[PDB]
């Protein structure tokens, strides 16, 4: 219903039809210069990862760390 977001500034409020918060970690094509990309938010269900994507899902307000 509310999740932590990538940025501390954006609204924790989830779009209607979610109570799954997620933490998504992966190497994009800048991984060698910048490190892994990180994304926090809401999903309808635990999102379907592609190869190499670390993912952690939880279902309580602002649980995604």
């Amino acid at each position: 219903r509310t999740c932590n977001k990538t940025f501390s500034d954006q609204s924790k409020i989830c779009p209607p039809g979610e109570n799954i918060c997620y933490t998504k970690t992966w190497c994009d094509a800048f991984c060698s210069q910048r490190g892994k990309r990180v994304e926090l938010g809401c999903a309808a269900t635990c999102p379907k990862v592609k190869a190499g994507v670390e993912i952690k899902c939880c279902s309580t307000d602002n649980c995604n760390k």
Partner: antibody, heavy 126, light 108 residues
Framework: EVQLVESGGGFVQPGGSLRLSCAASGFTFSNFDMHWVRQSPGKGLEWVSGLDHSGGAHYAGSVKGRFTISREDAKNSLDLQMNNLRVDDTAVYFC????????????????????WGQGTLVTVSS | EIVLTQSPSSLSASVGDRVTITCQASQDISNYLNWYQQKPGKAPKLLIYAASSLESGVPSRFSGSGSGTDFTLTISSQQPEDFATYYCQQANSFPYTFGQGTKVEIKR
């Protein structure tokens, strides 16, 4: 829902001025690099102007000294003031959000243009 | 300024065909190169950033490669919804520039 909605489109005489505006919604506007991209009928895309989250302004050579880009963070608005307009400035103008990607190493701005408004037409004609 | 030249400007594909579009940059742009799709009457949509990284929601049949001056967009199986204009764009240095666009049309 992330929305960029352009307004201020219309017709203007050559040598005339026209202010475009963009109402942003569903993100923390003040944190984002914002851009203007235009497209002449039947032709391709041209970057016009960018304004960084930190206030630095960037203009394409064709528009430098004629166009002024600005933001009002409080009103979630981006403006483009166009002056000394010529026929060849006739285009659909798109409001565009520069990406803001987060890594262990920090924040990176305007790697790409992830959100496009549906664009407003500006016709410069006598 | 950095000029991007796409090839071809138009290509004919059948549904199922593997489609390749080249982007050549007039100077080294590392991997700061993006691919956009545009349909008629509609705004461009980001497919690929950093020369080979897919944007969220983009189907896996889109793939990108290259660095320096030499870049390639691949659609591994052309679908009905993929008949569209594709643009490359460099985010290496101001002013940001686009290739001239590649129109993918139906072969017959």
């Amino acid at each position: 829902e992330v929305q960029l909605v352009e307004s201020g489109g219309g017709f203007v005489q050559p040598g005339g001025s026209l202010r475009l505006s963009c109402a942003a919604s569903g993100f923390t506007f003040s944190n984002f690099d914002m851009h203007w991209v235009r497209q002449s009928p039947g032709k391709g895309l041209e970057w016009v102007s960018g304004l960084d989250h930190s206030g630095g302004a960037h203009y394409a050579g064709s528009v430098k000294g004629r166009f002024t880009i600005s933001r009002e963070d409080a009103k979630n608005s981006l403006d483009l003031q166009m002056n000394n307009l010529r026929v060849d400035d006739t285009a659909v103008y798109f409001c565009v959000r520069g990406t803001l990607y987060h890594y262990t190493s920090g924040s990176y701005y305007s790697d790409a243009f992830d959100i496009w408004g549906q664009g407003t037409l500006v016709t410069v004609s006598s | 300024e950095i000029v991007l030249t796409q090839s071809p400007s138009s290509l004919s594909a059948s549904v199922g065909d593997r489609v390749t579009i080249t982007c050549q940059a007039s100077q080294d742009i590392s991997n700061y190169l993006n691919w956009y799709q545009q349909k008629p009457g509609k705004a461009p949509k980001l497919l690929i950033y950093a020369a080979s990284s897919l944007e969220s929601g983009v189907p896996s049949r889109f793939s990108g490669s290259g660095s320096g001056t030499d870049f390639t967009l691949t659609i591994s199986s052309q679908q009905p919804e993929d008949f569209a204009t594709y643009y490359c764009q460099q985010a290496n240095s101001f002013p940001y520039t686009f290739g001239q666009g590649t129109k993918v049309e139906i072969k017959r």
